[PDB]
Design a protein around this ligand. Sequence first.
Ligand SMILES: *[C@@H]1O[C@H](CO)[C@@H](O[C@@H]2O[C@H](CO)[C@@H](O[C@@H]3O[C@H](CO)[C@@H](O)[C@H](O)[C@@H]3O)[C@H](O)[C@H]2NC(C)=O)[C@H](O)[C@H]1NC(C)=O
Ligand SMILES: *[C@@H]1O[C@H](CO[C@@H]2O[C@@H](C)[C@@H](O)[C@@H](O)[C@@H]2O)[C@@H](O[C@@H]2O[C@H](CO)[C@@H](O)[C@H](O)[C@H]2NC(C)=O)[C@H](O)[C@H]1NC(C)=O
Ligand SMILES: *[C@@H]1O[C@H](CO)[C@@H](O[C@@H]2O[C@H](CO)[C@@H](O)[C@H](O)[C@H]2NC(C)=O)[C@H](O)[C@H]1NC(C)=O
Ligand SMILES: *[C@@H]1O[C@H](CO)[C@@H](O[C@@H]2O[C@H](CO)[C@@H](O)[C@H](O)[C@H]2NC(C)=O)[C@H](O)[C@H]1NC(C)=O
Ligand SMILES: *[C@@H]1O[C@H](CO[C@@H]2O[C@@H](C)[C@@H](O)[C@@H](O)[C@@H]2O)[C@@H](O)[C@H](O)[C@H]1NC(C)=O
Ligand SMILES: OCCN1C[C@H](O)[C@@H](O)[C@H](O)[C@H]1CO
Ligand SMILES: [Cl-]
Ligand SMILES: [Cl-]
Ligand SMILES: [Cl-]
Length: 845
Amino acid sequence: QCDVPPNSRFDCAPDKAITQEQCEARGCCYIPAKQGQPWCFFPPSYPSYKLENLSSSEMGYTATLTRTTPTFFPKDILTLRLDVMMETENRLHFTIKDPANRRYEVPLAPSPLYSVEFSEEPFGVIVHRQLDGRVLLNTTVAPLFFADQFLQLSTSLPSQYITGLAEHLSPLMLSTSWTRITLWNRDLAPTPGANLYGSHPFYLALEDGGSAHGVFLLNSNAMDVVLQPSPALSWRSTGGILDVYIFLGPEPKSVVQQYLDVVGYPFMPPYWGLGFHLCRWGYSSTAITRQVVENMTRAHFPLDVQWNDLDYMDSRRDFTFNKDGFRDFPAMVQELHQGGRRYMMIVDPAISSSGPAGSYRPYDEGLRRGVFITNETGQPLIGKVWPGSTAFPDFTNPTALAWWEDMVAEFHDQVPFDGMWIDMNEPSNFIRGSEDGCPNNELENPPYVPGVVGGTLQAATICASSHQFLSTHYNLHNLYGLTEAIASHRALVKARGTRPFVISRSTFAGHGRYAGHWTGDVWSSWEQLASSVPEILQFNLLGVPLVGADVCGFLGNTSEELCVRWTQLGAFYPFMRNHNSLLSLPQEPYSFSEPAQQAMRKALTLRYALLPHLYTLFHQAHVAGETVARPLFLEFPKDSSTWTVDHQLLWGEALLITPVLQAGKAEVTGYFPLGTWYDLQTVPIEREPAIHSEGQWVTLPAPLDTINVHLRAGYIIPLQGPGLTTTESRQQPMALAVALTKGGEARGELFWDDGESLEVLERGAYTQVIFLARNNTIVNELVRVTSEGAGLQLQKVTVLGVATAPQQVLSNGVPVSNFTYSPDTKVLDICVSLLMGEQFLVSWC
Ligand SMILES: *[C@@H]1O[C@H](CO)[C@@H](O[C@@H]2O[C@H](CO)[C@@H](O[C@@H]3O[C@H](CO)[C@@H](O)[C@H](O)[C@@H]3O)[C@H](O)[C@H]2NC(C)=O)[C@H](O)[C@H]1NC(C)=O
Ligand SMILES: *[C@@H]1O[C@H](CO[C@@H]2O[C@@H](C)[C@@H](O)[C@@H](O)[C@@H]2O)[C@@H](O[C@@H]2O[C@H](CO)[C@@H](O)[C@H](O)[C@H]2NC(C)=O)[C@H](O)[C@H]1NC(C)=O
Ligand SMILES: *[C@@H]1O[C@H](CO)[C@@H](O[C@@H]2O[C@H](CO)[C@@H](O)[C@H](O)[C@H]2NC(C)=O)[C@H](O)[C@H]1NC(C)=O
Ligand SMILES: *[C@@H]1O[C@H](CO)[C@@H](O[C@@H]2O[C@H](CO)[C@@H](O)[C@H](O)[C@H]2NC(C)=O)[C@H](O)[C@H]1NC(C)=O
Ligand SMILES: *[C@@H]1O[C@H](CO[C@@H]2O[C@@H](C)[C@@H](O)[C@@H](O)[C@@H]2O)[C@@H](O)[C@H](O)[C@H]1NC(C)=O
Ligand SMILES: OCCN1C[C@H](O)[C@@H](O)[C@H](O)[C@H]1CO
Ligand SMILES: [Cl-]
Ligand SMILES: [Cl-]
Ligand SMILES: [Cl-]
């Protein structure tokens, strides 16, 4: 019975330290590890549920599951209902529910790629990949627990390679060495082993050969996910139901798209949101804040969006501004707009509750309309945050949504801010639970407490048993940030009538449909620079492509060298903002030495040149569930050498970025998949020219002023001329960079709209163009042309991998006014006068 291989032992004492006698009294095996691995584990005969009355419907299957021997947790639900729904050829969905009681649920050849079978006793669901018979899910490997406050469902994993389960500071590929991953949204500076600000109960598992599948557990309760080296995984949740989606891929990119089909495709940001953002805690007046913009401009640094932190508020209260340093706040923001820039400011969820009645409308009106989370006696739960005593809005309450909309619109009428930076929305609390503590009940003190920092669900947040419109906070806590993001998205649409721009700290699965994210209070360290790459990649896999870390780091003091490298890498975060803590030394680009400034300016210039391409990538994310920043393994999954690479990133399919992530380095070694990769430094923007890789690591020169960026052969990138804002840059002529395959082929595209309006795709108010290189010609193919985009000027075409000097270069049949060819770099640079929205033909020979 107890002869179970060490790596396949599932823990029978996850709840407490246990003796041999107690372990054996549970019906479990006790075998100490020889050096983590559980000492108390389930024998193969441990009582589980039994499958009964399996029946077939048009959807799939239904059955009853019966447990006859209780577990060691209280309130086993002895009779359950199983429902299996074969929803698409790629998506399998099953639920396990209590048929006697509605439990909490998170609010909202022709053949499938999967096949499903069931084990009868012990009960399990087994999902095969039909094409190769690989076992993807097999829940028979351990008992099913389903008690009121403890659900556990386990499965074998098809390999040691698994990614997902945000938010944690870790490699992109998670460790299967007895790792406990905790999902409970928590205000904590990112550090390993800890539950951070968000929770995404989704994983993508790679399979030998390069196929992959994904699993989403649609459950918002505090949970542990435990990975072990057999390899296997156990979901351990503290409430709700088991609601499981399996996505069959087979390509990792298809897995992600299929997942996003369920939770939502990324929202389309406004174009200006892709520009540079600059912020700190400590810009303590409008004068100082205006000087930031002046100082950036004077030193030729692009800046699209100026931000303020808590500084602007009156006594740290939402929807106010102080009349000392920020007396002329409205005028400052109007001026920013006149110069072609936008403005963002921090908003906290918590609302000051201590002011004299009638003196602070957000609280007074909130009270009148019953918008706040309430406690046992039905009053607002009062915590402590920046303004002092605060109540917490309940963003599951439709009346609170209406109130938030009003507060945002009213404040916007005073100061016309262009989006919302929503912070502290875990929700963070400076004290435990509330000013008045929390009651003693099973929600506050549950039978299984996941591995949360502080050892309690109340730590750094509000009472678990507090009341929200849809349910208790116990069930809804992990949705708090998401629900505020939805409320703010709608608020901004109503107040401004154009695309919302919301950047949120706390997130849950599906967040990306409404908003972006930044990774929080990262230290200004080389370690955190390096860690930002896997984290940015992870959030893209989870459908939140508008993600980045605070450039140069938030906590502590940056060094000049670190800030150069971080600006270089950060210029490839899809969301790029330099933000800085209150007590830190300044780290704006203009605050550094001239050479450092030059390097920071080059990084920003390159990003701005790439903005039409980055915007097109966001379009693909929004319309097709693509990633914007993506790991090498998503693009080359059949090359197993890519699987553990997470200190390089791609933008889309074609742009490979290999950053220096350590002090004192003048070179960097990165993986180059099979193909030709052209050095982007050979493309004129206002050392081998090509790496010919067999699939191999290559050491690259990387002096302090350089970040390595390579363009994949077979791809065409649209670029646009420079500006200190997108308002300026969007008016510039465009260019193409055309990276030829050895056979002379390349493809790419451009998506263009007005940069801001809602319902663009539905209304068809966009231009969409494909570019094709073939047989010494470049043409455009007009997928759609409208007023927005038709008149975009193409003035430069740069062709990489042209082996021999051309004798003539033609544009629409006529010799061009000017071209140059470099025999050393194999680059043909062509001046033209063409329009993106009209069919052209460029050729050479
Ligand atoms: C539910 O939340 C409400 C707040 O909305 C809590 O009300 C608080 O109740 C405590 C006593 O339990 C009050 O403290 C008392 O204050 C007076 C002077 O102000 C003092 O003389 C007493 O000795 C005591 O300290 C507190 O003022 C009150 N808070 C507010 C804002 O009125 C209520 O206790 C919560 N209920 C539960 C079960 O947690
Ligand atoms: C498994 O199902 C049997 C049969 O249930 C009946 O047929 C089903 C298709 C559906 O129409 C049910 O409503 C029917 O009751 C269950 O056995 C029956 O139990 C009922 C109630 O105890 C009893 O009146 C009948 O005599 C039983 N019929 C037979 C043929 O045995 C059985 O309880 C189900 N098992 C579980 C674990 O739920
Ligand atoms: C799913 O997992 C279960 C449990 O690990 C596997 O069932 C065991 O299979 C071995 C080898 O065939 C047998 O010796 C045991 O009797 C089985 N255990 C139980 C509890 O049934 C099963 O093979 C797996 N299924 C697939 C398709 O991989
Ligand atoms: C913007 O740049 C100006 C000019 O460099 C800064 O003004 C200087 O500030 C220092 C304090 O660090 C003073 O010692 C000097 O007297 C100032 N010089 C000049 C020419 O005015 C200013 O601090 C910068 N402001 C911001 C917000 O970065
Ligand atoms: C960050 O730096 C703060 C100020 O440092 C002081 O002034 C600068 C210009 C340097 O000369 C430095 O050597 C001085 O000590 C410190 O007060 C603060 O503690 C620093 N923070 C951390 C986390 O190191
Ligand atoms: O309690 C700190 C609250 N906020 C935490 C955010 O992560 C950080 O970016 C921000 O500067 C800070 C002040 O608003
Ligand atoms: Cl013992
Ligand atoms: Cl397949
Ligand atoms: Cl409920």
